[PDB]
Amino acid sequence: LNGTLMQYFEWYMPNDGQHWKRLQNDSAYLAEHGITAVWIPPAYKGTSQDDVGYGAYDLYDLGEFHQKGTVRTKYGTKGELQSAINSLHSRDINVYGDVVINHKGGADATEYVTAVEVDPADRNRVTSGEQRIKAWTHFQFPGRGSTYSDFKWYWYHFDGTDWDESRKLNRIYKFQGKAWDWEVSNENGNYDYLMYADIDYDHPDVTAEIKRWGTWYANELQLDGFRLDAVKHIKFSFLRDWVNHVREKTGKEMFTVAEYWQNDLGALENYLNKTNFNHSVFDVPLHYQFHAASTQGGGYDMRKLLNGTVVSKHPVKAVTFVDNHDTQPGQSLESTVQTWFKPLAYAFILTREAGYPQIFYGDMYGTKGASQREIPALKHKIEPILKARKQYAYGAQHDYFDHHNIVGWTREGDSSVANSGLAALITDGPGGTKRMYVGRQNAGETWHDITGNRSDSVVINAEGWGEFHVNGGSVSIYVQR
């Protein structure tokens, strides 16, 4: 099984309401290129129509109720999403729903709340006496009413907020009688607080409600799994329990991957430990290695790609990726893998045996930000690498990370996939050649570069070795003609 995830959105897509229809219409294309799952953007009403989805106003409004100036979300209506999902399912493409449960944004009304300021660099330090603020904490859901859920939110379901509406002041406010949740990331002392109204996962009605919404959401969209947002800001034991709860209620596997944003393998290992390895994480350290290689012009030691990553230590729990909606140009975690290196990074995640790779909408189709640093559409460069995964990346792997610039790996093929087997080379510097073992069972075959970057044929010798070539700053992936 070479499962391939696709993140089916980018930050700057137009707010025209056609995204679910686009997905529906792309399902044939996705299936043909070996995509077996899609992570869809948050499907519920944000703070406005053009919310990318992380505002999280109303978790039960999937583009169904007239709230925040619109019925549809940015992406379309509930029915359009459901039509896209049934089209994806008709081609055996799993659908992972984005789960934004750190906070709620865009409350319907303010409440007077007693609060103290905390230090934004050290949220365990209180920096004021008690003061009365007006906080956006009251959620009534006037367009929805009680349809699907009569749960209403008030200040006492939250630990704090970043805005006092009476003084018009952006500070971090912790509400009276509240405490930041733990365990969370210990950056800035305690990183429970991120944005909007921060949900209090010490509150038992909150833990109950978010669990039952989880089950509701899975049922409503027939989800096959989840993508968990911003998990370093959400009580770890709660996330663990939430994942088990929805699995228990649905009776489905519910593959789950969490976005724990830290370039630190040890912090990710800690998160995995505290959630009992019941779900995966995005391989954030690998992303940063790709970013670094792509900006150092050949000076990066390409041997380092094998160490310090989630996929190197916990391959079963790694979702590997090149870029996402936070790392793309202009976004809050900007660390974009430069255009020239991006196909090499894709070869790395797509054709190697370890990890569950994810391709980025923004990489395939380009990003539509207002800058001139936008990622170009690289679909045509990635397609042959996807085909390499789908048809050729099977069987025993041999690594050649034995050079500062030119590194490679082979796959011997497997008898259960006809003509499978590949030989990949990437280089962040000058090109050249590497002899690599592809398996004696491929002796005498004529192999060629599926990317078309190199036009030479390589005949595998009797001992199972081929002499493979790669251009400067390029990738070649040889497979049987």
Ligand SMILES: OC[C@H]1O[C@H](O[C@H]2[C@H](O)[C@@H](O)[C@@H](O[C@H]3[C@H](O)[C@@H](O)[C@@H](O[C@H]4[C@H](O)[C@@H](O)[C@@H](O)O[C@@H]4CO)O[C@@H]3CO)O[C@@H]2CO)[C@H](O)[C@@H](O)[C@@H]1O
């Ligand atoms: O309809 C399409 C397919 O849907 C189903 O496949 C699912 C699996 O059920 C999910 O569990 C998941 O598979 C992941 C797996 O969870 C994850 O751990 C990872 O495993 C890799 C591992 O990273 C790697 O190091 C190496 O050991 O190989 C493992 C897999 O061979 O990646 C898996 C996907 O490659 O998602 C898929 C859908 O993408 C269903 O069971 C299939 O029958 C169906 O075709």
Ligand SMILES: [Ca+2]
């Ligand atoms: Ca939080």
Ligand SMILES: [Ca+2]
């Ligand atoms: Ca709390």
Ligand code: NA
């Ligand atoms: Na909290």
Ligand code: NA
């Ligand atoms: Na190098």
